[PDB]
Amino acid sequence: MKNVGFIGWRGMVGSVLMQRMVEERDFDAIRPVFFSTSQLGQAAPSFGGTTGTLQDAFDLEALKALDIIVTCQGGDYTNEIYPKLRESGWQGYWIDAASSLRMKDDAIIILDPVNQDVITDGLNNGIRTFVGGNCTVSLMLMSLGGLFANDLVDWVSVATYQAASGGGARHMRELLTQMGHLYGHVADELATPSSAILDIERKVTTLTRSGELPVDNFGVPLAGSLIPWIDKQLDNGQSREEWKGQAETNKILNTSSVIPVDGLCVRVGALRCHSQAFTIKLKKDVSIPTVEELLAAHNPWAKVVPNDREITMRELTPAAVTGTLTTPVGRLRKLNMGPEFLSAFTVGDQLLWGAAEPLRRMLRQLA
Amino acid sequence: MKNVGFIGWRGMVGSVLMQRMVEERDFDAIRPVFFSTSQLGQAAPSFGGTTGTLQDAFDLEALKALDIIVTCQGGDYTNEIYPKLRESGWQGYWIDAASSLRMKDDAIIILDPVNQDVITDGLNNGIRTFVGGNCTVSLMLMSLGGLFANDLVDWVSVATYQAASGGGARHMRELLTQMGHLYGHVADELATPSSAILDIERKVTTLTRSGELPVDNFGVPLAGSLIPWIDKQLDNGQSREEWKGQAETNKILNTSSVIPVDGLCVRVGALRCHSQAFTIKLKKDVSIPTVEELLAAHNPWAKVVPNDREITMRELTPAAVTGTLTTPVGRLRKLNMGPEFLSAFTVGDQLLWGAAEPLRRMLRQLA
Ligand SMILES: NC(=O)C1=CN([C@@H]2O[C@H](COP(=O)(O)OP(=O)(O)OC[C@H]3O[C@@H](n4cnc5c(N)ncnc54)[C@H](OP(=O)(O)O)[C@@H]3O)[C@@H](O)[C@H]2O)C=CC1
Ligand SMILES: NC(=O)C1=CN([C@@H]2O[C@H](COP(=O)(O)OP(=O)(O)OC[C@H]3O[C@@H](n4cnc5c(N)ncnc54)[C@H](OP(=O)(O)O)[C@@H]3O)[C@@H](O)[C@H]2O)C=CC1
């Protein structure tokens, strides 16, 4: 029985991760310890049928006692404790969800179904830090894994439809709240099916334009609009969120040569799943049936959806994926630009495969 | 004082078109009329000093009396009355917003700022039908007009973030309603900002997945998700909404050679504005400053937004455009694939430039 510490288990990711471990009875093989950063000393989760109290997430000594650490707290926490802990001589395993140590030397980005070999290699090479990549990239590779795995990709152009859950709980709750505010302001006009549309329109356009909407976690309203910028601003024209695309994809895949990945990461009113619209350029003119066969033959979760108007609406949508381990790919076909241009549209819960699952699976490897 | 008849002025478009005509004092140079297909007999608009009662938009004899007809009703009406009317020998002008006659020989797709010449030529050639193009395309050309106007485009790849207002009033009201249902179900949990996020999450995911959400106008929930298919299914892998991209763009621009336009049209929780993420391939390596200078030098509404994280959030969003005649373009820069790949992201009210305005401006031309 290994002493596994859990930090940031209360957050959006931690919660999904906890819920998942119970399902697969993940707590049966380990010795759970629950840390906190604001409720230190309080009653502990007891997920693994364990009775205790919340440990000091910042107690170095307390942290050095565990064989493994699983954090879903955030990058701010990592950058604060990790360097200080490794310095203390801690030679345990650090499984993280935050981006912090992703592009670091002593860390390996994990996506079992996509790069187990890399994982294993680094494992036999001394790597003790395993980090999950960006939920979107992690999702992209899970859905379009077959293509890369066959060296069929020349470069990729993405346009993401990212859900509010990506920013965390406060962000989701904010969207939902903003949602309510919007509706309420016109609940009566909506009650009267004939009432002029402009009346309802003006009313909602005004609310939004009025600082009345809670935008503390988004800076701007998202309920009835979108935001073309996710992460910080980089020294280039790229936004950190977009830049993660190319960097991490090559790291995860351990490519011999950079596979150009770029596009636009946009935040939308999507509640829980992350969807992406691709414009991939193939090295050779591969037939779509071959492509589909490949994508499906890469991993049990990569599910190809037919280019059907009905099916697409019923399956290639957050509402039909949110909560599932499936990572659908649809709207697959060649673009008018030529047969080397493949058009695809994926969707997937970024809290599972894009977050919790990779870690959960990795933890079981070291348990 | 021409006899201009107005049909379908009640809907999401007619309303906008009407509200605009008042603002610009458009009614002053014309003797209006107001028909209807669902409230014949009731009260008339009372816009341009002409109050009375809705007339029969199905009375051919009555229609033949007008010098011009402006419909915002819909394709079903057009397909029904237009052929029958032109047969009766009606030689008047027909300004439409409906797709029906767009790709027809006797019609011209209007976008004054983008193709005045074509409009004019067609006017001098005998064309009496002027139709506005798909909101999306119409918006793209208004925003990216400078590029095409300079033969700098090789082909375009779009991924649209289309608003609920595109489907009409019932569609918007539905989204808004769906919105309220979502929030309400978790109004209490949201009231307690410290409560567990999964509880709230589970609660909203259940509602959606349950047929309790009003999805009459969309077939599936949109409030907290999206739909990767807009129009009907074409005999190819393209969805009618996407297919409109290439066809109309070349018609409007009156291109000598087809400019490949393709991508994915998705419907989102956006309330009123249509945003688009492009991946355009230039014929030559044009510097971004040149591009920006061009885009801005094409038309007074094409506004280039700097690649600033702050500015972008504050301006390149539906909330900051909805209700304005401006068609912003931001996130402009070269993609990693090479200097010939320009990345752009536009936003614009599809009910103004995407709908009413083109007609409004055209009518005045014929007044
Ligand atoms: N959100 C997503 O979809 C994904 C996020 N990530 C990454 O994972 C890390 C954590 O992400 P995420 O789960 O979104 O973070 P959250 O902000 O939702 O959770 C992190 C911490 O926030 C605190 N918190 C404060 N208020 C609440 C509240 N009302 N409900 C729940 N928790 C609250 C908790 O601190 P305390 O210790 O006191 O309990 C918790 O551990 C980040 O580095 C992020 O970038 C990676 C993939 C996906
Ligand atoms: N929506 C958009 O942003 C754009 C739409 N178009 C095109 O314009 C055409 C019409 O679309 P649009 O105006 O959006 O459609 P709407 O359904 O919003 O309005 C058009 C007609 O719908 C009827 N209607 C039924 N119920 C309502 C209601 N509750 N509130 C208001 N009107 C109602 C009205 O008929 P009646 O008067 O008889 O009651 C009205 O004339 C289409 O062919 C479309 O493709 C083009 C560009 C943009």
PDB file of N, CA and C in Angstrom, chain A residues 12 155-157 160-161 173 177 189 192-193 195 198 201 209 224-226 228-229 232-233 237-238 242 246 262-263 266 271-272 279 307 309 316-317 319 322 331 333 336-337 345, chain B residues 10 15 155-157 160-161 172-173 189-190 192-193 195 197 201 209 224-226 228-229 232-233 237-238 242 246 262-263 271 275 279 307 309 316-317 319 322 324 331 333 336-337:
ATOM      1  N   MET A  12     -13.063  21.419  -9.788  1.00  0.00           N
ATOM      2  CA  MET A  12     -13.795  20.826 -10.900  1.00  0.00           C
ATOM      3  C   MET A  12     -13.176  19.496 -11.346  1.00  0.00           C
ATOM      4  N   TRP A 155       0.120  19.132 -41.153  1.00  0.00           N
ATOM      5  CA  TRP A 155      -0.083  20.233 -40.222  1.00  0.00           C
ATOM      6  C   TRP A 155      -1.564  20.318 -39.890  1.00  0.00           C
ATOM      7  N   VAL A 156      -1.894  20.995 -38.796  1.00  0.00           N
ATOM      8  CA  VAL A 156      -3.284  21.110 -38.378  1.00  0.00           C
ATOM      9  C   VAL A 156      -3.698  22.538 -38.077  1.00  0.00           C
ATOM     10  N   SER A 157      -4.949  22.855 -38.397  1.00  0.00           N
ATOM     11  CA  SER A 157      -5.510  24.176 -38.144  1.00  0.00           C
ATOM     12  C   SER A 157      -6.788  23.970 -37.345  1.00  0.00           C
ATOM     13  N   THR A 160     -11.290  26.124 -31.751  1.00  0.00           N
ATOM     14  CA  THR A 160     -11.978  25.479 -30.643  1.00  0.00           C
ATOM     15  C   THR A 160     -13.220  26.148 -30.086  1.00  0.00           C
ATOM     16  N   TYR A 161     -14.140  25.293 -29.650  1.00  0.00           N
ATOM     17  CA  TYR A 161     -15.404  25.682 -29.042  1.00  0.00           C
ATOM     18  C   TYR A 161     -15.267  25.172 -27.613  1.00  0.00           C
ATOM     19  N   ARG A 173     -20.169  28.192 -12.744  1.00  0.00           N
ATOM     20  CA  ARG A 173     -21.221  28.783 -11.929  1.00  0.00           C
ATOM     21  C   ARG A 173     -21.534  30.197 -12.410  1.00  0.00           C
ATOM     22  N   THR A 177     -25.008  31.404 -13.822  1.00  0.00           N
ATOM     23  CA  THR A 177     -25.625  32.550 -13.165  1.00  0.00           C
ATOM     24  C   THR A 177     -25.954  33.618 -14.208  1.00  0.00           C
ATOM     25  N   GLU A 189     -41.803  38.591 -21.198  1.00  0.00           N
ATOM     26  CA  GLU A 189     -41.907  38.741 -22.640  1.00  0.00           C
ATOM     27  C   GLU A 189     -41.866  37.371 -23.307  1.00  0.00           C
ATOM     28  N   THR A 192     -45.168  35.535 -23.137  1.00  0.00           N
ATOM     29  CA  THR A 192     -46.129  35.935 -24.161  1.00  0.00           C
ATOM     30  C   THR A 192     -45.524  35.650 -25.534  1.00  0.00           C
ATOM     31  N   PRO A 193     -45.785  34.450 -26.083  1.00  0.00           N
ATOM     32  CA  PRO A 193     -45.282  33.993 -27.386  1.00  0.00           C
ATOM     33  C   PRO A 193     -45.427  34.936 -28.578  1.00  0.00           C
ATOM     34  N   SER A 195     -45.505  38.455 -28.180  1.00  0.00           N
ATOM     35  CA  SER A 195     -44.778  39.678 -27.864  1.00  0.00           C
ATOM     36  C   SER A 195     -43.622  39.897 -28.846  1.00  0.00           C
ATOM     37  N   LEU A 198     -38.043  42.243 -30.895  1.00  0.00           N
ATOM     38  CA  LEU A 198     -37.131  43.349 -30.604  1.00  0.00           C
ATOM     39  C   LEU A 198     -37.182  43.769 -29.140  1.00  0.00           C
ATOM     40  N   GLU A 201     -35.166  41.362 -27.363  1.00  0.00           N
ATOM     41  CA  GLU A 201     -33.796  41.571 -27.818  1.00  0.00           C
ATOM     42  C   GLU A 201     -33.131  42.745 -27.111  1.00  0.00           C
ATOM     43  N   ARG A 209     -24.538  44.573 -22.086  1.00  0.00           N
ATOM     44  CA  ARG A 209     -23.755  45.793 -22.238  1.00  0.00           C
ATOM     45  C   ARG A 209     -23.682  46.584 -20.936  1.00  0.00           C
ATOM     46  N   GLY A 224     -24.281  34.977 -23.309  1.00  0.00           N
ATOM     47  CA  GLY A 224     -24.797  35.140 -24.659  1.00  0.00           C
ATOM     48  C   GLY A 224     -23.805  35.580 -25.726  1.00  0.00           C
ATOM     49  N   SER A 225     -22.525  35.289 -25.518  1.00  0.00           N
ATOM     50  CA  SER A 225     -21.496  35.666 -26.481  1.00  0.00           C
ATOM     51  C   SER A 225     -20.318  34.693 -26.420  1.00  0.00           C
ATOM     52  N   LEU A 226     -19.132  35.166 -26.794  1.00  0.00           N
ATOM     53  CA  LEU A 226     -17.940  34.328 -26.778  1.00  0.00           C
ATOM     54  C   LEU A 226     -16.688  35.176 -26.597  1.00  0.00           C
ATOM     55  N   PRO A 228     -12.622  35.304 -27.935  1.00  0.00           N
ATOM     56  CA  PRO A 228     -11.546  34.841 -28.822  1.00  0.00           C
ATOM     57  C   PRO A 228     -10.146  34.748 -28.215  1.00  0.00           C
ATOM     58  N   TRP A 229     -10.051  34.783 -26.889  1.00  0.00           N
ATOM     59  CA  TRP A 229      -8.753  34.704 -26.220  1.00  0.00           C
ATOM     60  C   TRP A 229      -8.876  33.925 -24.913  1.00  0.00           C
ATOM     61  N   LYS A 232      -3.050  33.644 -21.379  1.00  0.00           N
ATOM     62  CA  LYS A 232      -2.309  34.898 -21.424  1.00  0.00           C
ATOM     63  C   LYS A 232      -1.814  35.219 -22.825  1.00  0.00           C
ATOM     64  N   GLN A 233      -1.272  36.420 -22.985  1.00  0.00           N
ATOM     65  CA  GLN A 233      -0.752  36.868 -24.270  1.00  0.00           C
ATOM     66  C   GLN A 233       0.735  36.542 -24.365  1.00  0.00           C
ATOM     67  N   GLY A 237       2.000  36.484 -31.822  1.00  0.00           N
ATOM     68  CA  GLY A 237       0.594  36.775 -32.038  1.00  0.00           C
ATOM     69  C   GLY A 237      -0.297  35.678 -31.483  1.00  0.00           C
ATOM     70  N   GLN A 238       0.335  34.640 -30.951  1.00  0.00           N
ATOM     71  CA  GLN A 238      -0.369  33.493 -30.391  1.00  0.00           C
ATOM     72  C   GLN A 238      -0.792  33.744 -28.950  1.00  0.00           C
ATOM     73  N   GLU A 242      -3.448  28.676 -27.467  1.00  0.00           N
ATOM     74  CA  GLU A 242      -3.228  28.196 -28.828  1.00  0.00           C
ATOM     75  C   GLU A 242      -1.829  27.614 -28.967  1.00  0.00           C
ATOM     76  N   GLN A 246       0.684  23.214 -30.586  1.00  0.00           N
ATOM     77  CA  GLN A 246       1.862  22.667 -31.248  1.00  0.00           C
ATOM     78  C   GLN A 246       2.906  22.105 -30.298  1.00  0.00           C
ATOM     79  N   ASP A 262      -1.788  24.914 -35.166  1.00  0.00           N
ATOM     80  CA  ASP A 262      -2.138  26.294 -34.854  1.00  0.00           C
ATOM     81  C   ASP A 262      -3.609  26.561 -35.133  1.00  0.00           C
ATOM     82  N   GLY A 263      -4.113  27.665 -34.599  1.00  0.00           N
ATOM     83  CA  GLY A 263      -5.505  28.006 -34.812  1.00  0.00           C
ATOM     84  C   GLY A 263      -6.012  29.035 -33.825  1.00  0.00           C
ATOM     85  N   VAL A 266     -11.360  29.585 -28.761  1.00  0.00           N
ATOM     86  CA  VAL A 266     -12.448  30.454 -28.326  1.00  0.00           C
ATOM     87  C   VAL A 266     -13.297  29.841 -27.210  1.00  0.00           C
ATOM     88  N   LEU A 271     -21.535  24.295 -21.781  1.00  0.00           N
ATOM     89  CA  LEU A 271     -21.476  23.968 -20.369  1.00  0.00           C
ATOM     90  C   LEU A 271     -20.336  23.057 -19.937  1.00  0.00           C
ATOM     91  N   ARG A 272     -20.194  21.891 -20.560  1.00  0.00           N
ATOM     92  CA  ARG A 272     -19.138  20.976 -20.130  1.00  0.00           C
ATOM     93  C   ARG A 272     -18.163  20.355 -21.134  1.00  0.00           C
ATOM     94  N   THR A 279      -9.021  21.474 -39.856  1.00  0.00           N
ATOM     95  CA  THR A 279      -8.740  21.631 -41.274  1.00  0.00           C
ATOM     96  C   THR A 279      -7.340  21.051 -41.366  1.00  0.00           C
ATOM     97  N   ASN A 307     -21.225  11.251 -41.518  1.00  0.00           N
ATOM     98  CA  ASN A 307     -21.583  12.599 -41.939  1.00  0.00           C
ATOM     99  C   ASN A 307     -23.080  12.700 -42.192  1.00  0.00           C
ATOM    100  N   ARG A 309     -26.788  14.346 -41.052  1.00  0.00           N
ATOM    101  CA  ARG A 309     -27.373  15.512 -40.400  1.00  0.00           C
ATOM    102  C   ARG A 309     -28.085  15.140 -39.108  1.00  0.00           C
ATOM    103  N   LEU A 316     -22.778  14.261 -32.089  1.00  0.00           N
ATOM    104  CA  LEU A 316     -21.627  15.164 -32.103  1.00  0.00           C
ATOM    105  C   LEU A 316     -21.962  16.488 -31.429  1.00  0.00           C
ATOM    106  N   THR A 317     -22.368  16.404 -30.168  1.00  0.00           N
ATOM    107  CA  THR A 317     -22.737  17.579 -29.398  1.00  0.00           C
ATOM    108  C   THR A 317     -22.431  17.349 -27.914  1.00  0.00           C
ATOM    109  N   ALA A 319     -23.960  17.886 -25.228  1.00  0.00           N
ATOM    110  CA  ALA A 319     -25.081  17.271 -24.531  1.00  0.00           C
ATOM    111  C   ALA A 319     -25.081  15.746 -24.635  1.00  0.00           C
ATOM    112  N   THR A 322     -20.953  14.866 -22.742  1.00  0.00           N
ATOM    113  CA  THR A 322     -20.709  15.281 -21.363  1.00  0.00           C
ATOM    114  C   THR A 322     -20.942  14.149 -20.365  1.00  0.00           C
ATOM    115  N   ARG A 331     -18.249  14.889 -39.219  1.00  0.00           N
ATOM    116  CA  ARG A 331     -18.090  15.868 -40.282  1.00  0.00           C
ATOM    117  C   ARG A 331     -16.756  15.647 -40.986  1.00  0.00           C
ATOM    118  N   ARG A 333     -14.541  14.660 -44.094  1.00  0.00           N
ATOM    119  CA  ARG A 333     -14.600  14.679 -45.545  1.00  0.00           C
ATOM    120  C   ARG A 333     -13.507  15.581 -46.083  1.00  0.00           C
ATOM    121  N   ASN A 336     -12.963  21.560 -50.217  1.00  0.00           N
ATOM    122  CA  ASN A 336     -12.914  21.987 -51.606  1.00  0.00           C
ATOM    123  C   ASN A 336     -11.519  22.353 -52.105  1.00  0.00           C
ATOM    124  N   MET A 337     -10.630  22.726 -51.191  1.00  0.00           N
ATOM    125  CA  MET A 337      -9.259  23.099 -51.549  1.00  0.00           C
ATOM    126  C   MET A 337      -8.486  21.962 -52.219  1.00  0.00           C
ATOM    127  N   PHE A 345     -14.476  17.397 -37.158  1.00  0.00           N
ATOM    128  CA  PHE A 345     -15.070  18.102 -36.030  1.00  0.00           C
ATOM    129  C   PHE A 345     -15.201  17.119 -34.879  1.00  0.00           C
TER     130      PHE A 345
ATOM    131  N   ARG B  10     -42.570  41.443 -39.420  1.00  0.00           N
ATOM    132  CA  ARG B  10     -42.779  41.102 -38.021  1.00  0.00           C
ATOM    133  C   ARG B  10     -41.607  40.339 -37.405  1.00  0.00           C
ATOM    134  N   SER B  15     -38.398  43.286 -38.251  1.00  0.00           N
ATOM    135  CA  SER B  15     -38.340  44.188 -37.108  1.00  0.00           C
ATOM    136  C   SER B  15     -37.117  45.079 -37.252  1.00  0.00           C
ATOM    137  N   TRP B 155      -7.817  30.539 -51.162  1.00  0.00           N
ATOM    138  CA  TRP B 155      -8.953  29.752 -50.693  1.00  0.00           C
ATOM    139  C   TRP B 155      -9.178  30.069 -49.223  1.00  0.00           C
ATOM    140  N   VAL B 156     -10.362  29.752 -48.721  1.00  0.00           N
ATOM    141  CA  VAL B 156     -10.690  30.043 -47.333  1.00  0.00           C
ATOM    142  C   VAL B 156     -11.268  28.849 -46.593  1.00  0.00           C
ATOM    143  N   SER B 157     -10.930  28.746 -45.312  1.00  0.00           N
ATOM    144  CA  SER B 157     -11.423  27.670 -44.460  1.00  0.00           C
ATOM    145  C   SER B 157     -12.054  28.329 -43.246  1.00  0.00           C
ATOM    146  N   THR B 160     -17.634  28.541 -38.240  1.00  0.00           N
ATOM    147  CA  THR B 160     -18.535  29.549 -37.705  1.00  0.00           C
ATOM    148  C   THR B 160     -19.127  29.324 -36.323  1.00  0.00           C
ATOM    149  N   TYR B 161     -19.289  30.434 -35.610  1.00  0.00           N
ATOM    150  CA  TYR B 161     -19.882  30.455 -34.280  1.00  0.00           C
ATOM    151  C   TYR B 161     -21.162  31.260 -34.492  1.00  0.00           C
ATOM    152  N   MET B 172     -34.502  31.994 -30.984  1.00  0.00           N
ATOM    153  CA  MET B 172     -33.864  32.787 -29.950  1.00  0.00           C
ATOM    154  C   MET B 172     -34.616  32.590 -28.640  1.00  0.00           C
ATOM    155  N   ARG B 173     -35.920  32.857 -28.671  1.00  0.00           N
ATOM    156  CA  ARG B 173     -36.761  32.713 -27.488  1.00  0.00           C
ATOM    157  C   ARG B 173     -36.572  31.337 -26.875  1.00  0.00           C
ATOM    158  N   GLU B 189     -28.335  25.772  -5.439  1.00  0.00           N
ATOM    159  CA  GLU B 189     -26.948  25.324  -5.354  1.00  0.00           C
ATOM    160  C   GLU B 189     -26.014  26.470  -5.705  1.00  0.00           C
ATOM    161  N   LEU B 190     -26.440  27.305  -6.649  1.00  0.00           N
ATOM    162  CA  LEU B 190     -25.644  28.447  -7.074  1.00  0.00           C
ATOM    163  C   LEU B 190     -25.691  29.506  -5.984  1.00  0.00           C
ATOM    164  N   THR B 192     -25.490  28.988  -2.949  1.00  0.00           N
ATOM    165  CA  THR B 192     -24.461  28.629  -1.983  1.00  0.00           C
ATOM    166  C   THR B 192     -23.182  28.434  -2.796  1.00  0.00           C
ATOM    167  N   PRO B 193     -22.355  29.486  -2.903  1.00  0.00           N
ATOM    168  CA  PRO B 193     -21.105  29.408  -3.667  1.00  0.00           C
ATOM    169  C   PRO B 193     -20.078  28.393  -3.156  1.00  0.00           C
ATOM    170  N   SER B 195     -21.015  25.202  -2.126  1.00  0.00           N
ATOM    171  CA  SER B 195     -21.518  23.856  -2.372  1.00  0.00           C
ATOM    172  C   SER B 195     -20.680  23.119  -3.412  1.00  0.00           C
ATOM    173  N   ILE B 197     -19.456  21.315  -6.711  1.00  0.00           N
ATOM    174  CA  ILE B 197     -19.690  21.598  -8.121  1.00  0.00           C
ATOM    175  C   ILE B 197     -20.342  20.444  -8.872  1.00  0.00           C
ATOM    176  N   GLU B 201     -23.363  20.360 -11.420  1.00  0.00           N
ATOM    177  CA  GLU B 201     -23.086  19.778 -12.724  1.00  0.00           C
ATOM    178  C   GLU B 201     -24.065  18.651 -13.054  1.00  0.00           C
ATOM    179  N   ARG B 209     -30.023  16.179 -20.919  1.00  0.00           N
ATOM    180  CA  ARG B 209     -30.206  14.816 -21.397  1.00  0.00           C
ATOM    181  C   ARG B 209     -31.650  14.354 -21.287  1.00  0.00           C
ATOM    182  N   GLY B 224     -26.813  24.910 -23.359  1.00  0.00           N
ATOM    183  CA  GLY B 224     -25.495  24.553 -22.858  1.00  0.00           C
ATOM    184  C   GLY B 224     -24.624  23.679 -23.750  1.00  0.00           C
ATOM    185  N   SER B 225     -24.858  23.715 -25.059  1.00  0.00           N
ATOM    186  CA  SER B 225     -24.059  22.924 -25.991  1.00  0.00           C
ATOM    187  C   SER B 225     -24.016  23.595 -27.361  1.00  0.00           C
ATOM    188  N   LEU B 226     -23.841  22.807 -28.419  1.00  0.00           N
ATOM    189  CA  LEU B 226     -23.785  23.352 -29.771  1.00  0.00           C
ATOM    190  C   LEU B 226     -24.231  22.316 -30.790  1.00  0.00           C
ATOM    191  N   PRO B 228     -23.255  21.001 -34.749  1.00  0.00           N
ATOM    192  CA  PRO B 228     -22.368  20.986 -35.920  1.00  0.00           C
ATOM    193  C   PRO B 228     -23.044  20.912 -37.293  1.00  0.00           C
ATOM    194  N   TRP B 229     -24.346  21.166 -37.348  1.00  0.00           N
ATOM    195  CA  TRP B 229     -25.068  21.121 -38.617  1.00  0.00           C
ATOM    196  C   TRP B 229     -26.164  22.177 -38.642  1.00  0.00           C
ATOM    197  N   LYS B 232     -29.980  21.989 -44.295  1.00  0.00           N
ATOM    198  CA  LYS B 232     -30.270  20.629 -44.739  1.00  0.00           C
ATOM    199  C   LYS B 232     -29.008  19.899 -45.168  1.00  0.00           C
ATOM    200  N   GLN B 233     -29.153  18.605 -45.425  1.00  0.00           N
ATOM    201  CA  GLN B 233     -28.041  17.773 -45.853  1.00  0.00           C
ATOM    202  C   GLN B 233     -27.987  17.736 -47.380  1.00  0.00           C
ATOM    203  N   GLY B 237     -20.815  15.809 -48.804  1.00  0.00           N
ATOM    204  CA  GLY B 237     -20.562  15.791 -47.373  1.00  0.00           C
ATOM    205  C   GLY B 237     -20.797  17.153 -46.745  1.00  0.00           C
ATOM    206  N   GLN B 238     -21.137  18.120 -47.585  1.00  0.00           N
ATOM    207  CA  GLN B 238     -21.374  19.485 -47.134  1.00  0.00           C
ATOM    208  C   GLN B 238     -22.803  19.672 -46.644  1.00  0.00           C
ATOM    209  N   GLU B 242     -22.952  25.395 -45.187  1.00  0.00           N
ATOM    210  CA  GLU B 242     -21.537  25.489 -45.537  1.00  0.00           C
ATOM    211  C   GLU B 242     -21.379  25.715 -47.031  1.00  0.00           C
ATOM    212  N   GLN B 246     -19.021  28.965 -50.526  1.00  0.00           N
ATOM    213  CA  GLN B 246     -18.347  29.069 -51.815  1.00  0.00           C
ATOM    214  C   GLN B 246     -19.233  29.594 -52.940  1.00  0.00           C
ATOM    215  N   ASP B 262     -14.751  26.846 -47.840  1.00  0.00           N
ATOM    216  CA  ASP B 262     -15.329  25.684 -47.178  1.00  0.00           C
ATOM    217  C   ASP B 262     -15.010  25.687 -45.693  1.00  0.00           C
ATOM    218  N   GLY B 263     -15.732  24.871 -44.934  1.00  0.00           N
ATOM    219  CA  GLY B 263     -15.496  24.801 -43.505  1.00  0.00           C
ATOM    220  C   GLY B 263     -16.646  24.164 -42.757  1.00  0.00           C
ATOM    221  N   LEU B 271     -26.218  34.791 -28.624  1.00  0.00           N
ATOM    222  CA  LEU B 271     -27.552  35.354 -28.712  1.00  0.00           C
ATOM    223  C   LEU B 271     -27.897  36.054 -30.015  1.00  0.00           C
ATOM    224  N   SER B 275     -19.971  34.995 -35.324  1.00  0.00           N
ATOM    225  CA  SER B 275     -18.516  35.108 -35.321  1.00  0.00           C
ATOM    226  C   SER B 275     -17.914  33.985 -36.157  1.00  0.00           C
ATOM    227  N   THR B 279      -8.905  30.613 -41.700  1.00  0.00           N
ATOM    228  CA  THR B 279      -7.577  30.079 -41.963  1.00  0.00           C
ATOM    229  C   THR B 279      -7.472  30.296 -43.464  1.00  0.00           C
ATOM    230  N   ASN B 307      -4.157  42.581 -32.208  1.00  0.00           N
ATOM    231  CA  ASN B 307      -4.011  41.285 -31.557  1.00  0.00           C
ATOM    232  C   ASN B 307      -3.669  41.457 -30.084  1.00  0.00           C
ATOM    233  N   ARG B 309      -4.869  40.966 -26.070  1.00  0.00           N
ATOM    234  CA  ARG B 309      -5.718  40.138 -25.216  1.00  0.00           C
ATOM    235  C   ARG B 309      -6.839  40.943 -24.578  1.00  0.00           C
ATOM    236  N   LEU B 316     -13.877  42.224 -29.774  1.00  0.00           N
ATOM    237  CA  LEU B 316     -14.134  41.112 -30.694  1.00  0.00           C
ATOM    238  C   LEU B 316     -15.059  40.080 -30.051  1.00  0.00           C
ATOM    239  N   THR B 317     -16.235  40.540 -29.636  1.00  0.00           N
ATOM    240  CA  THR B 317     -17.221  39.683 -28.991  1.00  0.00           C
ATOM    241  C   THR B 317     -18.631  40.174 -29.322  1.00  0.00           C
ATOM    242  N   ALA B 319     -21.243  40.611 -27.640  1.00  0.00           N
ATOM    243  CA  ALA B 319     -21.706  41.598 -26.674  1.00  0.00           C
ATOM    244  C   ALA B 319     -21.278  43.017 -27.028  1.00  0.00           C
ATOM    245  N   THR B 322     -23.241  43.383 -31.197  1.00  0.00           N
ATOM    246  CA  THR B 322     -24.693  43.266 -31.331  1.00  0.00           C
ATOM    247  C   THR B 322     -25.396  44.614 -31.323  1.00  0.00           C
ATOM    248  N   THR B 324     -24.633  47.004 -33.710  1.00  0.00           N
ATOM    249  CA  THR B 324     -23.792  47.959 -34.413  1.00  0.00           C
ATOM    250  C   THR B 324     -23.604  47.549 -35.862  1.00  0.00           C
ATOM    251  N   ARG B 331      -7.408  39.004 -34.213  1.00  0.00           N
ATOM    252  CA  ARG B 331      -6.612  37.790 -34.181  1.00  0.00           C
ATOM    253  C   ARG B 331      -5.963  37.568 -35.539  1.00  0.00           C
ATOM    254  N   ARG B 333      -2.879  37.306 -37.981  1.00  0.00           N
ATOM    255  CA  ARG B 333      -1.464  36.978 -37.967  1.00  0.00           C
ATOM    256  C   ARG B 333      -1.228  35.753 -38.829  1.00  0.00           C
ATOM    257  N   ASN B 336       1.450  29.019 -38.084  1.00  0.00           N
ATOM    258  CA  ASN B 336       2.703  28.273 -38.068  1.00  0.00           C
ATOM    259  C   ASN B 336       3.008  27.517 -39.361  1.00  0.00           C
ATOM    260  N   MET B 337       1.974  27.167 -40.123  1.00  0.00           N
ATOM    261  CA  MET B 337       2.165  26.433 -41.375  1.00  0.00           C
ATOM    262  C   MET B 337       2.990  27.200 -42.401  1.00  0.00           C
TER     263      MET B 337
END
